[PDB]
Amino acid sequence: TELRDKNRKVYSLFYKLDVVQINNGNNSSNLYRLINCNTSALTQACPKVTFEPI
Amino acid sequence: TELRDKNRKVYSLFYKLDVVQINNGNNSSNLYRLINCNTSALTQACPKVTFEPIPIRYCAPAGYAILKCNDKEFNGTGLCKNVSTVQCTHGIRPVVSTQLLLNGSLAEGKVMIRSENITNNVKNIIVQLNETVTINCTRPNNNTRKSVRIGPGQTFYATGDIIGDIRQAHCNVSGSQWNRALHQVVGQLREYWNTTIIFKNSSGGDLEITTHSFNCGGEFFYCNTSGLFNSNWTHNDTASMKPNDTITLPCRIKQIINMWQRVGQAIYAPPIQGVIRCESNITGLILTRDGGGNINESQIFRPGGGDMRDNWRSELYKYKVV
Amino acid sequence: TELRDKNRKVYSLFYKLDVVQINNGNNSSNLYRLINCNTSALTQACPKVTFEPI
Amino acid sequence: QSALTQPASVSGSPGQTITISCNGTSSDVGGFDSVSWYQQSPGKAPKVMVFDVSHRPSGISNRFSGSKSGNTASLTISGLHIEDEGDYFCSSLTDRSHRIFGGGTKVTVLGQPKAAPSVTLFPPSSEELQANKATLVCLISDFYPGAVTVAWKADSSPVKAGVETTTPSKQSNNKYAASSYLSLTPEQWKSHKSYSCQVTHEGSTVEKTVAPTECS
Amino acid sequence: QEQLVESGGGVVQPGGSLRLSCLASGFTFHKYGMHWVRQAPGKGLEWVALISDDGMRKYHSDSMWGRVTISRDNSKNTLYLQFSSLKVEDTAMFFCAREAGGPIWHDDVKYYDFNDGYYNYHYMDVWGKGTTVTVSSASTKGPSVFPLAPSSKSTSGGTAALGCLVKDYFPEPVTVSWNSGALTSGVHTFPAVLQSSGLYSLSSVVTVPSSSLGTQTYICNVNHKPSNTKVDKRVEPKSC
Ligand SMILES: *[C@@H]1O[C@H](CO)[C@@H](O[C@@H]2O[C@H](CO)[C@@H](O[C@@H]3O[C@H](CO[C@H]4O[C@H](CO[C@H]5O[C@H](CO)[C@@H](O)[C@H](O)[C@@H]5O)[C@@H](O)[C@H](O[C@H]5O[C@H](CO)[C@@H](O)[C@H](O)[C@@H]5O)[C@@H]4O)[C@@H](O)[C@H](O[C@H]4O[C@H](CO)[C@@H](O)[C@H](O)[C@@H]4O)[C@@H]3O)[C@H](O)[C@H]2NC(C)=O)[C@H](O)[C@H]1NC(C)=O
Ligand SMILES: *[C@@H]1O[C@H](CO)[C@@H](O[C@@H]2O[C@H](CO)[C@@H](O[C@@H]3O[C@H](CO[C@H]4O[C@H](CO)[C@@H](O)[C@H](O)[C@@H]4O[C@@H]4O[C@H](CO)[C@@H](O[C@@H]5O[C@H](CO)[C@H](O)[C@H](O)[C@H]5O)[C@H](O)[C@H]4NC(C)=O)[C@@H](O)[C@H](O)[C@@H]3O)[C@H](O)[C@H]2NC(C)=O)[C@H](O)[C@H]1NC(C)=O
Ligand SMILES: *[C@@H]1O[C@H](CO)[C@@H](O[C@@H]2O[C@H](CO)[C@@H](O[C@@H]3O[C@H](CO[C@H]4O[C@H](CO)[C@@H](O)[C@H](O)[C@@H]4O)[C@@H](O)[C@H](O[C@H]4O[C@H](CO)[C@@H](O)[C@H](O)[C@@H]4O)[C@@H]3O)[C@H](O)[C@H]2NC(C)=O)[C@H](O)[C@H]1NC(C)=O
Ligand SMILES: *[C@@H]1O[C@H](CO[C@@H]2O[C@@H](C)[C@@H](O)[C@@H](O)[C@@H]2O)[C@@H](O[C@@H]2O[C@H](CO)[C@@H](O[C@@H]3O[C@H](CO)[C@@H](O)[C@H](O)[C@@H]3O)[C@H](O)[C@H]2NC(C)=O)[C@H](O)[C@H]1NC(C)=O
Ligand SMILES: *[C@@H]1O[C@H](CO)[C@@H](O[C@@H]2O[C@H](CO)[C@@H](O[C@@H]3O[C@H](CO)[C@@H](O)[C@H](O)[C@@H]3O)[C@H](O)[C@H]2NC(C)=O)[C@H](O)[C@H]1NC(C)=O
Ligand SMILES: *[C@@H]1O[C@H](CO)[C@@H](O[C@@H]2O[C@H](CO)[C@@H](O[C@@H]3O[C@H](CO)[C@@H](O)[C@H](O)[C@@H]3O)[C@H](O)[C@H]2NC(C)=O)[C@H](O)[C@H]1NC(C)=O
Ligand SMILES: *[C@@H]1O[C@H](CO)[C@@H](O[C@@H]2O[C@H](CO)[C@@H](O[C@@H]3O[C@H](CO)[C@@H](O)[C@H](O)[C@@H]3O)[C@H](O)[C@H]2NC(C)=O)[C@H](O)[C@H]1NC(C)=O
Ligand SMILES: *[C@@H]1O[C@H](CO)[C@@H](O[C@@H]2O[C@H](CO)[C@@H](O[C@@H]3O[C@H](CO)[C@@H](O)[C@H](O)[C@@H]3O)[C@H](O)[C@H]2NC(C)=O)[C@H](O)[C@H]1NC(C)=O
Ligand SMILES: *[C@@H]1O[C@H](CO)[C@@H](O[C@@H]2O[C@H](CO)[C@@H](O[C@@H]3O[C@H](CO)[C@@H](O)[C@H](O)[C@@H]3O)[C@H](O)[C@H]2NC(C)=O)[C@H](O)[C@H]1NC(C)=O
Ligand SMILES: *[C@@H]1O[C@H](CO)[C@@H](O[C@@H]2O[C@H](CO)[C@@H](O[C@@H]3O[C@H](CO)[C@@H](O)[C@H](O)[C@@H]3O)[C@H](O)[C@H]2NC(C)=O)[C@H](O)[C@H]1NC(C)=O
Ligand SMILES: *[C@@H]1O[C@H](CO[C@@H]2O[C@@H](C)[C@@H](O)[C@@H](O)[C@@H]2O)[C@@H](O[C@@H]2O[C@H](CO)[C@@H](O)[C@H](O)[C@H]2NC(C)=O)[C@H](O)[C@H]1NC(C)=O
Ligand SMILES: *[C@@H]1O[C@H](CO)[C@@H](O)[C@H](O)[C@H]1NC(C)=O
Ligand SMILES: *[C@@H]1O[C@H](CO)[C@@H](O)[C@H](O)[C@H]1NC(C)=O
Ligand SMILES: *[C@@H]1O[C@H](CO)[C@@H](O)[C@H](O)[C@H]1NC(C)=O
Ligand SMILES: *[C@@H]1O[C@H](CO)[C@@H](O)[C@H](O)[C@H]1NC(C)=O
Ligand SMILES: *[C@@H]1O[C@H](CO)[C@@H](O)[C@H](O)[C@H]1NC(C)=O
Ligand SMILES: *[C@@H]1O[C@H](CO)[C@@H](O)[C@H](O)[C@H]1NC(C)=O
Ligand SMILES: *[C@@H]1O[C@H](CO)[C@@H](O)[C@H](O)[C@H]1NC(C)=O
């Protein structure tokens, strides 16, 4: 949450290509990891900026 | 703590304005959150950096000059002949304030008045007096500082337990010279009339416009502009000069602000330990005419401090880059 | 770990001068703080950049 | 469905340590460690004394602690305070996410000595005989703790029909009282030469006898 | 503070229904999965029902399953329980208890639900006022008072005990006094035991000296308020 200690679980929709099932366990079992997080950091793409040609 | 695993709960002093209640347990020891944290970010104010205004002089490059009109009657825009070419402007003290100007060069000879469009009441009426008056907003009781280390070299300057009786910070104004300056102004305010005017207070809105906000050692002093409109120089100015008013009035204090409506990484003003006393001259005003007023019967004026740029061009009407 | 919440107890080796005991460690294997952490921060030395003179 | 079983009541001296222990099953106690202990004082709604058995809820001092062993839970209290009196109930969450409460244990601070019950037996009054009814009232009174068992019998045979034993009700003098009722007919009352009420407190025991006797 | 108040409970008969309403204040009731509990006469606590924060799922004891249906109202900040096919065993005080605070705690970090919901599945931290419900099959009837003759409660010292047995009355309670409330020492009224005929019975007993009989007169004033019946029955040493 906006405060330090306050947290909360929330749901959304995501694709399969964004993450991969963590193979450390038996199977996925609702357990995934980002493909790019373990390699480097990640930040948003500033949605007010688009990616159209000029 | 500077260690990752170790934390610590510690107490200090904070204001009510700096936070808002949440978890609306309508009244049982309700919790509070910072007003700027929930909407934006926050950082330290770098207490070693000061906040007082120094006279700034803006110099022009080669191939350019600064033409000044030394005529005292010369209004904002118009033609002028008494020319003075200069390379750097007079030292302007950028007093960050609303509805008032402090420590500025006086418009000697006569009170100067300006406005974008006199017919449009919404436009700001700039004023520049010809005599100063001491306005003293003050927190006499001392402050306290406590450096609580949050990280490996990161520390916050919290307000510790204050020593002695914690008297509320308030403010003072001398009514004699203020009423004299008002006499001069209402003598100047006659655009087409000889005696009719009304002075009311602000209509309400943003907190900075609702009061006279300014800076004092980093502490954002929101001193109240309520003793201003309590006067009627309608018919007899001497009738309004006879009630002297040594105005002792309230003045609130704030720690955080969004500068220039920049709702971002705000700054917490740090402890200022020692007595705080902002005594200042007066040089001018930024008033506004009410929309709900007749054409010729009486124009109601009231303080307005929305556009901060109006506070800075008060002395730049003399100069112009050429 | 590379994951956010995941933590792993891994072991390494530190110099004797780079740390100092804490918590009133009269005689025991008490914890150890860094000599410069509580004074200021610390970051990696970018090992690809060598510090030799030219 | 079966409540977590614990003793009906216990007691202890001021400051004396004690430990209630309630039984359960593996589906609720051994399957998931979310076992709690509530307390209800006479004249008060229930209030939680333990949850998260190795931790305690709000308003609970360090005197109260909890432990678990397989299908059983235990509530330890060292330094018995005056506020510790009341009925404690252990409860556990089942595998079906349902809750189940315990049988109950009335904790009380000792300081009241134990007294024997001044038992008596009222015959069936003439106002009842004329109304084609009869009733024997075995009155138990002035006994502590509130654990007595009443039984009825004829002059030589037992009596089970019509028996209605009342629970021990706390008297105004901090002791207990009760009234067991045996409903009979006038002919049945006059047939048996004498009825008797046998009442058993803690280990010592008492009995009262009544017989029909017609007079002026 | 965070307060809960039950209402709607009252005397009823089996086979009907009942609407127990639990109002709440002092917190955001929109996501607090409440708990309906009952306490019967001479019995411990017994869980009745539980509802989730969003009302999606719900749990009822297998004994009370089917007879009761639980629901929430976030607009009213209220909880509701609708009964059906009431049983005489349902005689109890029903309470409406909260869940384990707003968030769930772990390692000093607090987790709220989806859309910042106040969810848990844990102990019940807060309990409500409580409302009584008395399911009974017998019909309303006036009482029958009879005098229990002076019986020696203690052999030594000469301590007798007079009584007045009230029986065959319904519904509870029955007030009794001795000499219009003047005599109070030794007075004791027992709880209304459910007779085999569906009616109720108790005994107002008074312990006095055995020598006080004859000189000290005793008249027990019984008053069954549900039936609005009143009597003043005398007690004396049995002549027979
Ligand atoms: C700075 O951060 C800390 C970090 O949490 C934070 O601490 C919490 O502060 C709040 C507000 O004051 C406390 O709320 C009160 O807590 C009182 C007692 O709480 C006990 O129970 C807590 C809940 O237990 C669960 O959660 C923990 C994880 O949090 C979990 O491990 C447990 O197993 C269990 O599931 C518990 O957190 C807390 O822990 C302390 O004590 C234990 C020993 O018991 C110790 O081992 C811990 O290290 C820690 O010191 C504690 O045990 C409670 O009485 C109080 O209740 C009020 O409200 C009710 C009505 O609801 C009234 O009837 C009553 O009279 C009280 O007025 C309230 O709930 C919370 O407990 C703190 N938790 C911790 C872990 O410290 C600080 O608040 C933060 N600082 C600020 C300024 O906010
Ligand atoms: C992605 O796919 C996943 C894989 O399917 C989805 O998860 C779940 O997978 C399960 C795989 O086995 C699916 O199981 C099936 O469920 C079928 C439906 O069973 C219910 O309905 C039938 C009637 O059609 C009923 O006979 C069943 O018993 C069951 O409902 C019963 O309902 C009553 C009344 O509500 C319950 O009674 C409760 O009693 C207690 C007291 O004891 C309280 O009083 C309660 O308040 C009260 O409700 C009763 O308990 C309940 N029965 C049981 C056993 O709990 C079934 O016919 C099939 O044979 C098969 O078993 C499962 O349906 C599926 N989930 C869903 C939601 O479909 C996953 O959901 C999906 N992802 C998403 C996002 O949906
Ligand atoms: C990120 O978001 C996910 C999704 O919301 C969270 O997932 C769950 O989070 C909860 C809360 O942290 C976890 O709860 C804990 O579960 C563990 C398992 O407990 C028992 O239950 C299972 C199922 O019956 C048994 O098989 C198992 O053997 C255990 O017996 C325990 O660590 C905890 O239980 C103990 O603590 C509770 C206090 O809440 C006590 O009341 C209990 O008696 C017990 O002593 C706890 O219940 C849950 O496991 C998570 N599930 C999954 C699939 O991840 C993540 O927690 C969340 N992470 C963060 C960092 O926010
Ligand atoms: C994946 O999605 C399912 C289904 O969620 C439902 O469908 C989605 C497409 C969205 O429209 C969601 O907004 C919607 O809820 C999640 O399961 C759960 O399904 C139940 C259905 O019975 C949802 O119940 C609702 O609860 C709200 C609030 O209590 C009520 O007002 C509604 O009337 C309804 O009963 C439940 O919300 C939903 N859970 C969540 C978290 O949305 C499933 O959880 C999800 N997957 C994951 C990993 O979260
Ligand atoms: C603005 O100027 C005024 C006047 O100079 C200051 O007023 C001061 O107000 C305080 C509290 O209201 C007074 O304290 C009390 O004074 C009385 C009378 O002397 C005394 O009996 C009490 O025990 C208490 O000390 C104080 O006297 C008063 N000043 C004077 C000179 O009388 C005010 O503080 C100034 N500052 C502002 C408004 O910020
Ligand atoms: C606002 O503050 C200014 C100063 O920053 C105040 O002006 C000063 O007021 C003091 C008295 O409070 C003056 O000192 C006195 O002067 C007289 C002579 O006039 C002398 O006899 C006394 O012994 C004492 O020294 C001081 O001269 C004066 N200075 C200036 C520049 O005006 C002002 O009064 C304050 N106004 C309000 C409304 O608080
Ligand atoms: C700045 O100062 C002005 C006055 O100097 C403050 O405005 C005044 O505030 C008071 C308190 O709210 C108003 O009093 C009112 O009195 C009526 C009497 O019936 C009562 O019903 C109201 O509830 C209220 O208490 C007063 O009218 C008002 N205006 C004046 C005096 O012109 C203002 O609040 C101050 N602002 C700050 C930020 O300090
Ligand atoms: C500023 O104050 C002066 C006073 O020093 C005002 O002058 C006076 O104004 C009053 C009316 O307000 C005049 O009274 C007149 O009385 C006659 C009856 O004798 C009546 O018929 C008139 O209609 C009027 O009411 C008074 O003569 C006049 N005196 C002087 C010496 O001028 C002045 O009017 C005030 N300023 C403004 C703009 O009104
Ligand atoms: C504004 O402040 C000035 C101070 O510079 C006040 O002037 C003085 O005002 C008082 C009355 O408020 C006058 O009092 C009178 O004094 C004479 C003796 O000179 C006495 O006989 C009277 O009975 C009365 O007490 C005082 O003379 C006067 N002094 C001066 C130099 O003007 C002025 O009155 C204040 N304004 C208001 C509206 O009160
Ligand atoms: C307008 O001009 C006046 C006068 O130049 C400014 O007054 C200044 O006010 C501040 C506090 O508000 C004073 O700071 C303190 O000064 C004492 C002097 O001993 C020092 O010991 C403290 O450590 C602290 O620095 C300052 O001295 C004072 N006078 C100056 C700067 O000449 C006023 O601040 C100006 N207006 C604005 C909005 O800045
Ligand atoms: C992570 O640390 C915890 C806590 O141990 C302390 O902190 C360490 C950083 C180190 O300084 C230790 O010497 C300290 O004693 C380890 O301990 C367990 O943590 C888990 C999770 O909180 C908890 O459930 C267990 O009860 C803890 N057990 C003990 C004996 O403390 C933990 O093991 C460390 N992580 C790993 C992956 O080992
Ligand atoms: C997969 O599951 C099997 C059986 O549960 C287990 O023996 C094995 O260790 C699991 N694989 C892992 C943990 O990689
Ligand atoms: C304000 O508090 C009262 C109790 O003090 C409560 O009943 C009321 O609901 C609260 N207001 C709101 C808007 O919840
Ligand atoms: C014109 O400027 C000169 C500068 O030399 C100054 O002395 C003079 O007073 C000015 N006159 C007017 C009317 O501004
Ligand atoms: C100040 O200006 C007013 C009007 O603006 C004028 O009447 C007065 O004489 C001026 N005073 C000076 C220049 O000292
Ligand atoms: C001022 O505004 C009025 C209308 O509000 C307009 O008629 C007039 O021309 C304007 N004057 C100037 C100088 O802009
Ligand atoms: C309290 O005020 C006095 C002035 O009287 C000052 O000397 C002292 O430093 C102040 N205390 C602080 C800053 O802690
Ligand atoms: C000025 O006069 C008007 C009358 O038009 C009055 O409403 C107002 O209150 C007066 N001003 C003050 C400060 O009293």
Short mmCIF file of N, CA, C and O in Angstrom, two decimals, chain E residues 61-99:
data_model
loop_
_atom_site.label_atom_id
_atom_site.label_comp_id
_atom_site.label_asym_id
_atom_site.label_seq_id
_atom_site.Cartn_x
_atom_site.Cartn_y
_atom_site.Cartn_z
N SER E 61 -23.24 -25.01 10.63
CA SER E 61 -23.08 -26.27 11.32
C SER E 61 -24.09 -27.28 10.80
O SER E 61 -25.21 -26.93 10.43
N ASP E 62 -23.68 -28.55 10.74
CA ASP E 62 -24.53 -29.60 10.18
C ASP E 62 -25.83 -29.75 10.94
O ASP E 62 -26.85 -30.14 10.36
N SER E 63 -25.83 -29.45 12.25
CA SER E 63 -27.08 -29.47 13.00
C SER E 63 -27.98 -28.32 12.57
O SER E 63 -29.17 -28.52 12.28
N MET E 64 -27.44 -27.11 12.51
CA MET E 64 -28.18 -25.92 12.09
C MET E 64 -28.21 -25.73 10.57
O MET E 64 -28.85 -24.79 10.10
N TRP E 65 -27.53 -26.59 9.81
CA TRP E 65 -27.52 -26.45 8.36
C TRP E 65 -28.92 -26.67 7.79
O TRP E 65 -29.62 -27.61 8.18
N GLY E 66 -29.32 -25.79 6.88
CA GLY E 66 -30.64 -25.83 6.27
C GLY E 66 -31.67 -24.99 7.01
O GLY E 66 -32.51 -24.34 6.39
N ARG E 67 -31.61 -25.00 8.35
CA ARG E 67 -32.58 -24.25 9.13
C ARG E 67 -32.32 -22.75 9.07
O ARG E 67 -33.26 -21.96 9.18
N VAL E 68 -31.06 -22.34 8.88
CA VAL E 68 -30.65 -20.94 8.91
C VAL E 68 -29.98 -20.59 7.59
O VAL E 68 -29.34 -21.43 6.95
N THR E 69 -30.13 -19.32 7.20
CA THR E 69 -29.48 -18.77 6.01
C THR E 69 -28.95 -17.39 6.36
O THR E 69 -29.69 -16.54 6.85
N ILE E 70 -27.66 -17.18 6.09
CA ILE E 70 -26.94 -15.97 6.47
C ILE E 70 -26.78 -15.08 5.25
O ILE E 70 -26.68 -15.56 4.11
N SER E 71 -26.76 -13.77 5.48
CA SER E 71 -26.58 -12.81 4.40
C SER E 71 -26.04 -11.51 4.97
O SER E 71 -26.11 -11.26 6.17
N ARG E 72 -25.50 -10.68 4.07
CA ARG E 72 -24.89 -9.40 4.41
C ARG E 72 -25.57 -8.28 3.64
O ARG E 72 -26.28 -8.51 2.65
N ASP E 73 -25.35 -7.05 4.11
CA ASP E 73 -25.87 -5.86 3.44
C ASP E 73 -24.84 -4.76 3.68
O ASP E 73 -24.83 -4.13 4.74
N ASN E 74 -23.96 -4.56 2.69
CA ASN E 74 -22.90 -3.57 2.83
C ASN E 74 -23.43 -2.15 2.79
O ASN E 74 -22.84 -1.24 3.39
N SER E 75 -24.54 -1.92 2.08
CA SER E 75 -25.13 -0.58 2.05
C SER E 75 -25.63 -0.18 3.43
O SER E 75 -25.37 0.93 3.90
N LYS E 76 -26.36 -1.08 4.10
CA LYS E 76 -26.82 -0.84 5.46
C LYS E 76 -25.74 -1.07 6.51
O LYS E 76 -25.94 -0.67 7.66
N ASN E 77 -24.61 -1.70 6.14
CA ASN E 77 -23.60 -2.12 7.11
C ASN E 77 -24.21 -3.04 8.15
O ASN E 77 -24.09 -2.81 9.36
N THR E 78 -24.88 -4.09 7.68
CA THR E 78 -25.70 -4.95 8.52
C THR E 78 -25.53 -6.40 8.08
O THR E 78 -25.14 -6.68 6.95
N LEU E 79 -25.82 -7.31 9.01
CA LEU E 79 -25.84 -8.74 8.76
C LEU E 79 -27.22 -9.26 9.13
O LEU E 79 -27.89 -8.71 10.00
N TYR E 80 -27.64 -10.34 8.46
CA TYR E 80 -28.98 -10.88 8.62
C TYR E 80 -28.92 -12.40 8.64
O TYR E 80 -28.12 -13.01 7.93
N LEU E 81 -29.77 -13.00 9.48
CA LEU E 81 -29.91 -14.45 9.58
C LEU E 81 -31.39 -14.78 9.57
O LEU E 81 -32.13 -14.34 10.46
N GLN E 82 -31.82 -15.54 8.57
CA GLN E 82 -33.21 -15.96 8.40
C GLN E 82 -33.31 -17.43 8.79
O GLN E 82 -32.62 -18.28 8.21
N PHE E 83 -34.18 -17.72 9.75
CA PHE E 83 -34.37 -19.08 10.24
C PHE E 83 -35.47 -19.78 9.45
O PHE E 83 -36.19 -19.17 8.65
N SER E 84 -35.60 -21.08 9.67
CA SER E 84 -36.65 -21.87 9.05
C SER E 84 -36.72 -23.22 9.75
O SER E 84 -35.69 -23.83 10.03
N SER E 85 -37.94 -23.68 10.03
CA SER E 85 -38.19 -24.95 10.71
C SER E 85 -37.52 -24.95 12.08
O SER E 85 -36.70 -25.81 12.40
N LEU E 86 -37.89 -23.96 12.89
CA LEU E 86 -37.27 -23.78 14.20
C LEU E 86 -37.55 -24.98 15.10
O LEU E 86 -38.60 -25.63 14.99
N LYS E 87 -36.59 -25.29 15.97
CA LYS E 87 -36.65 -26.41 16.89
C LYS E 87 -36.54 -25.90 18.32
O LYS E 87 -35.94 -24.85 18.58
N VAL E 88 -37.12 -26.66 19.25
CA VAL E 88 -37.09 -26.29 20.67
C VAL E 88 -35.66 -26.27 21.20
O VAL E 88 -35.35 -25.54 22.14
N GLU E 89 -34.77 -27.06 20.60
CA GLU E 89 -33.36 -27.05 20.99
C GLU E 89 -32.65 -25.76 20.63
O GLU E 89 -31.53 -25.54 21.11
N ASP E 90 -33.24 -24.91 19.79
CA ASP E 90 -32.64 -23.65 19.39
C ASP E 90 -32.78 -22.55 20.45
O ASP E 90 -32.40 -21.40 20.16
N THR E 91 -33.31 -22.85 21.63
CA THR E 91 -33.39 -21.87 22.71
C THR E 91 -31.99 -21.43 23.10
O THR E 91 -31.19 -22.23 23.59
N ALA E 92 -31.66 -20.15 22.88
CA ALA E 92 -30.31 -19.67 23.13
C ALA E 92 -30.26 -18.16 22.97
O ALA E 92 -31.15 -17.54 22.37
N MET E 93 -29.19 -17.58 23.51
CA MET E 93 -28.81 -16.20 23.22
C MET E 93 -27.85 -16.22 22.04
O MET E 93 -26.81 -16.87 22.09
N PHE E 94 -28.23 -15.52 20.96
CA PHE E 94 -27.45 -15.46 19.74
C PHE E 94 -26.61 -14.19 19.73
O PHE E 94 -27.13 -13.10 20.00
N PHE E 95 -25.32 -14.34 19.44
CA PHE E 95 -24.36 -13.26 19.35
C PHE E 95 -23.81 -13.15 17.94
O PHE E 95 -23.77 -14.14 17.19
N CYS E 96 -23.35 -11.95 17.60
CA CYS E 96 -22.83 -11.60 16.27
C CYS E 96 -21.43 -11.03 16.47
O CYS E 96 -21.27 -9.87 16.88
N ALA E 97 -20.42 -11.84 16.17
CA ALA E 97 -19.02 -11.54 16.45
C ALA E 97 -18.28 -11.21 15.16
O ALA E 97 -18.60 -11.72 14.08
N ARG E 98 -17.27 -10.35 15.29
CA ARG E 98 -16.49 -9.89 14.15
C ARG E 98 -15.41 -10.93 13.84
O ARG E 98 -15.33 -11.99 14.47
N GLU E 99 -14.57 -10.64 12.85
CA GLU E 99 -13.43 -11.44 12.43
C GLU E 99 -12.14 -10.75 12.88
O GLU E 99 -12.16 -9.67 13.47
#
